């Protein structure tokens, strides 16, 4: 299974930004409350404007993630010197487009701008993670890290912005994004564990965790309120995720049979291989009409599982003559979560650079 064709990955679109006329509010606040000439801050305002323009039209590469984190930190610095939150003195309208409706949403709240930048940080990470072919340990490692970063951005957004400014950033939807991103990260790690030919039991646990993450995401997609909001998107996501649930259940039980093989339990080996074959056949049914990338991975895995099942049954029928335990006799594999939402630190000086408004008293 070292060279199994790579499954495709889901990514989220970035949000489109509208106006954020912070310049008049900062100049007004600077004169009124700091007693300084507002024109003395034209250079600082130019820098923040150039940073926002770069961040809202972020280059869809690795360096784009740094631009978003840098801008996010500078927004925290500004809010600590000029109050632009809800009901505060220098608050101005912030406008972004909501993903599912395509409609403009405006809030007079700088934390709404922070929230959208952090969503797009996770969205961009999901994009970069899904772009790679994962045929190199460098691209496999980068993709695994990207999906973990995406989970962390959405997780940070879920925790520190429980006021859902729009429905695409609501708790239930962000929870779906986090679980989906963690499943794809664990999936990348699974491909690595099978490349190294790690112990069979650990690979089973790693694949079983892929299943667990995708099962959590599939539950959210089957929620009627999530399905009505996502619309067609729920249909496309649920098709890939539901198939992957059975695909990686098959991979998990394939390696449980390998453990049974290593433990000289040749009747138990038949039971796990037959289970893996059944689960993979269900994944094949679920993959009708899916791209060739999915078909090529199922077909490769079928050659492995199908051959190993036939060989194991032949060995048991004519050599070992051991009892084949039922399906419901077997302890279910416990997933081994070896990925995590990588933390977001908004005011990390290494990611923000100097405070743009450091001279503002």
Binding site for another protein (CB under 8 A): 141, 144-145, 148, 185, 189, 192-193, 196, 198-199, 202, 206, 336, 338-339
Least distance between another protein and beta carbon 160 (Å): 23
Could you give the CA distance from residue 156 to residue 162 in angstroms, rounded to a whole number?
A: 10
Computed from CA positions of residues 58, 60, 66, 72, in that sequence, does the dihedral angle turn out positive or negative?
Answer: positive
Helices marked H in the chain? 22-34, 42-56, 62-81, 110-131, 137-160, 171-195, 200-222, 224-230, 232-262, 266-286, 292-315, 349-352
Helices marked H in 82-199? 110-131, 137-160, 171-195
- Kindly tell me which of 147 and 237 has the beta carbon lying closer to another protein: 147
Least distance between another protein and beta carbon 189 (Å): 5
- Kindly tell me which of 167 and 202 has the beta carbon lying closer to another protein: 202
Least distance between another protein and beta carbon 305 (Å): 23
Least distance between another protein and beta carbon 62 (Å): 17
- Kindly tell me which of 49 and 196 has the beta carbon lying closer to another protein: 196
- Kindly tell me which of 144 and 249 has the beta carbon lying closer to another protein: 144
Cβ distance 351 to 345 under 8 Å?
yes
Cβ distance 116 to 17 under 8 Å?
yes
- Kindly tell me which of 291 and 343 has the beta carbon lying closer to another protein: 343
- Kindly tell me which of 159 and 196 has the beta carbon lying closer to another protein: 196
- Kindly tell me which of 152 and 166 has the beta carbon lying closer to another protein: 152
For 173-182, give one letter per residue: b (16+ CB within 10 A) or e. bbbbbbbbbb
Least distance between another protein and beta carbon 145 (Å): 8
Cβ distance 243 to 294 under 8 Å?
yes
Could you give the CA distance from residue 109 to residue 106 in angstroms, rounded to a whole number?
A: 9
Least distance between another protein and beta carbon 1 (Å): 15
- Kindly tell me which of 150 and 220 has the beta carbon lying closer to another protein: 150
- Kindly tell me which of 44 and 212 has the beta carbon lying closer to another protein: 212
Least distance between another protein and beta carbon 3 (Å): 19
Least distance between another protein and beta carbon 221 (Å): 25
Dihedral angle of Cα 281, 286, 290, 292, to the nearest 10 degrees: -10
The gap from C-alpha 167 to its chain's centroid, in whole angstroms, comes to 18
* Token reading at 275: 């289970």
Computed from CA positions of residues 68, 73, 77, 80, in that sequence, does the dihedral angle turn out positive or negative?
Answer: positive
Could you give the CA distance from residue 160 to residue 111 in angstroms, rounded to a whole number?
A: 10
Least distance between another protein and beta carbon 334 (Å): 13
228: how many CB neighbours lie within 10 A of its CB? 9
């Amino acid at each position: 299974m070292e060279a199994v064709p790579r499954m495709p990955m889901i990514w989220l679109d970035l949000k489109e930004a509208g106006d954020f006329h912070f310049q008049p509010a900062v100049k007004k606040f600077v004169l009124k409350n700091y007693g300084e000439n507002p024109e003395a801050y034209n250079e600082e305002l130019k820098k923040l404007e150039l940073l926002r323009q770069n961040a809202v039209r972020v280059p869809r590469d690795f360096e784009g993630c740094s631009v978003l984190r840098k801008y996010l930190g500078q927004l925290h610095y500004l809010q600590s010197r000029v109050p632009m939150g809800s009901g505060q003195e220098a608050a101005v309208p912030v406008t972004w487009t909501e993903i599912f409706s395509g409609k403009s949403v405006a809030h007079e709240d700088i934390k709404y701008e922070q929230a959208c930048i952090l969503y797009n940080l996770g969205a961009l990470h999901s994009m970069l993670g899904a772009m790679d072919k994962r045929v190199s340990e460098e691209g496999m490692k980068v993709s695994c890290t990207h999906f973990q970063c995406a989970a962390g951005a959405f997780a940070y957004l879920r925790e520190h912005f429980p006021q859902a400014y729009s429905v695409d950033m609501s708790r239930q939807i962000l929870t779906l994004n986090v679980n989906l991103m963690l499943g794809q990260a664990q999936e990348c790690l699974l491909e690595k564990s099978m490349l190294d030919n790690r112990k069979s039991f650990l690979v089973a646990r790693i694949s079983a965790q892929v299943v667990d993450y995708y099962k959590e995401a599939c539950r959210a997609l089957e929620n009627p309120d999530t399905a009505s909001l996502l619309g067609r998107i729920q249909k496309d996501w649920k098709k890939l995720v539901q198939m992957k649930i059975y695909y990686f259940a098959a991979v998990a039980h394939l390696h449980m049979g390998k453990q049974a093989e290593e433990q000289q339990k040749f009747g138990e080996r038949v039971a796990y291989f037959q289970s893996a074959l059944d689960k993979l056949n269900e994944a094949i049914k679920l993959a009708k009409g899916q791209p060739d990338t999915v078909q090529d991975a199922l077909r490769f895995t079928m050659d492995v599982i199908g051959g190993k099942y036939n060989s194991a049954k032949k060995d048991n029928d004519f050599i070992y003559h051991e009892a084949v335990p039922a399906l419901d006799t077997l302890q279910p594999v416990k997933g081994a979560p070896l990925v995590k939402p990588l933390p977001v630190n908004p005011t990390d000086p290494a990611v923000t650079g100097p405070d743009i408004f450091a001279k503002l008293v």
